[PDB]
Amino acid sequence: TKVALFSGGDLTYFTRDFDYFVGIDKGSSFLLKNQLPLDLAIGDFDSVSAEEFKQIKAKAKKLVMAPAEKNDTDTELALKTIFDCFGRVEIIVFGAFGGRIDHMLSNIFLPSDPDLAPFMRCFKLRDEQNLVEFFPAGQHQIEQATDMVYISFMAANGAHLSIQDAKYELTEENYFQKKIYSSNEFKDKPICFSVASGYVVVIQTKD
């Protein structure tokens, strides 16, 4: 019931404890190259040699060819596909960062897509020292994840945030403008945060 997507980012970190393995473009080649299952290879594969795509084309339990010129990114397309086949499943996206900033932002703001927003609570961005979760507009609580030390909140579409029970709080009584409030920490208690509309992007990090 646990799916794992190996994006085209830099997979210097990844886990193997997963039911289904999805590989976007280069991720497909990475998976194989690491003695790992390739249940699904998706994307336009414009980021892999014919030599590599030859091994993927004859090893992937399933392969999806996506148009070169489109609106959704291979990772976006991959997440949309899976949510259709499995429905509300738990996803972890590896290699969602690195290299290009435009692509990273695309992953950081995946929920911004109307079709993904509803499932924004089913997938996460993860790598060596970063963990990214997405919360719909409203009231929420969060407990610190293992390994991680710092935590930050950022509302896509500038809606005022509220943060309590954290080392640094953000009340309506001391609010100071900033897109992302980083370097915050827990303190033996769940952190409370909320947002009138949109959705919040929580980023737990370490090091």
Ligand X SMILES: Cc1ncc(C[n+]2csc(CCOP(=O)(O)OP(=O)(O)O)c2C)c(N)n1
Residues annotated in the binding site, as ranges?
A: 25, 44, 46, 70-71, 74, 100, 103, 183
Q: Alpha helices, DSSP H only, in 98-164? A: 101-108
* Residue ranges in 99-118 that form contacts with ligand X under rule CB under 6 A: 103
The entry of a second copy, Mg ion, ligand X, none near residue 170 (CB within 5 to 8 angstroms by kind) is ligand X
Residues annotated in the binding site for thiamine diphosphate, as ranges?
A: 70-71, 74, 100, 103, 183
Given candidates 71, 146, 171, 177, which one binds ligand X under the rule CB under 6 A? 71
* Residue ranges in 101-120 that form contacts with a second copy under rule CB under 8 A: 101-106, 108-109, 112-114
Q: What are the two backbone dihedrals, phi and then psi, of residue 128, each rounded to the nearest 5 degrees?
A: -30, -65
The entry of Mg ion, a second copy, ligand X, none near residue 39 (CB within 5 to 8 angstroms by kind) is none
Count residues contacting ligand X (CB under 6 A)? Answer: 15
Neighbour-count burial for 138-147, b at 16+ CB within 10 Å, e otherwise: eebebebbee
**AA identity, residue 33:** K
Count residues contacting a second copy (CB under 8 A)? Answer: 36
Question: What secondary structure letter does DSSP report for 181?
Answer: E
Least distance in angstroms from the C-beta of 53 to a second copy: 19
Is 34 a binder of ligand X (CB under 6 A)?
A: no
Least distance in angstroms from the C-beta of 87 to a second copy: 22
Q: Between 55 and 106, whose beta carbon lies closer to ligand X?
A: 106
| 12 Cβ neighbours under 8 A, 6+ residues apart | 127, 128
| 71 Cβ neighbours under 8 A, 6+ residues apart | none
Per DSSP, the three-state class of 23 is: strand
Is 136 a binder of a second copy (CB under 8 A)?
A: no
Residues annotated in the binding site for Mg(2+), as ranges?
A: 25, 44, 46, 74
Cα–Cα distance for residue pair 197/10, rounded to 1 Å: 33
Strand pairing report for 150-156 and 191-205: antiparallel
Cβ pair 36, 16 in contact under 8 A: yes
**AA identity, residue 17:** D
Least distance in angstroms from the C-beta of 44 to ligand X: 6
* Residue ranges in 135-164 that form contacts with ligand X under rule CB under 6 A: 163
